[PDB]
């Protein structure tokens, strides 16, 4: 019924009202407190700069510092991209500090989007693509991004 990872987010989203991140927002619209409504955006100077990205957030009951779960609502080409749509990042790990805030994650993958991390990547066809082919990379970036570009 009750638990205290329930109650730390709850003190999470007024703080967040305070002074949301600039760039990403993270914080839920009608969804309960479990699904979480958050939109990401291209950093500048990049080919997403101009795109638009939106990502939901997860939750669990388990622990406050428990590895949460996060993965994007549009299906798009990234550099690195788990089987579930998941983000490989070292938060998704045990390596998340209870520190930091729900914003933390969603500076987290912005900056992913600028430039990723060779280090055993999860989607080798497009890592490599990025040091072979820059033209078909570049396509499959403009292409993703128009899907969600424009909706009305």
Known sequence: ???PARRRLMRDF???????????????????IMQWNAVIFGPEGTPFEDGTFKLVIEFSEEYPNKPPTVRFLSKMFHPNVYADG?????????????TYDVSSILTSIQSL?????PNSPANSQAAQLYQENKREYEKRVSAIVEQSWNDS
């Open 1 to 3: 019924m009750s638990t």
């Open 14 to 32: 007024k703080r967040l009202q305070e002074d949301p991140p600039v760039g990403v927002s993270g914080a839920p619209s009608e969804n309960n």
């Open 86 to 98: 998941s983000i490989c990042l070292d938060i998704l790990q045990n390596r998340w500090s209870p």
């Open 113 to 117: 989007l600028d430039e990723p991390n």
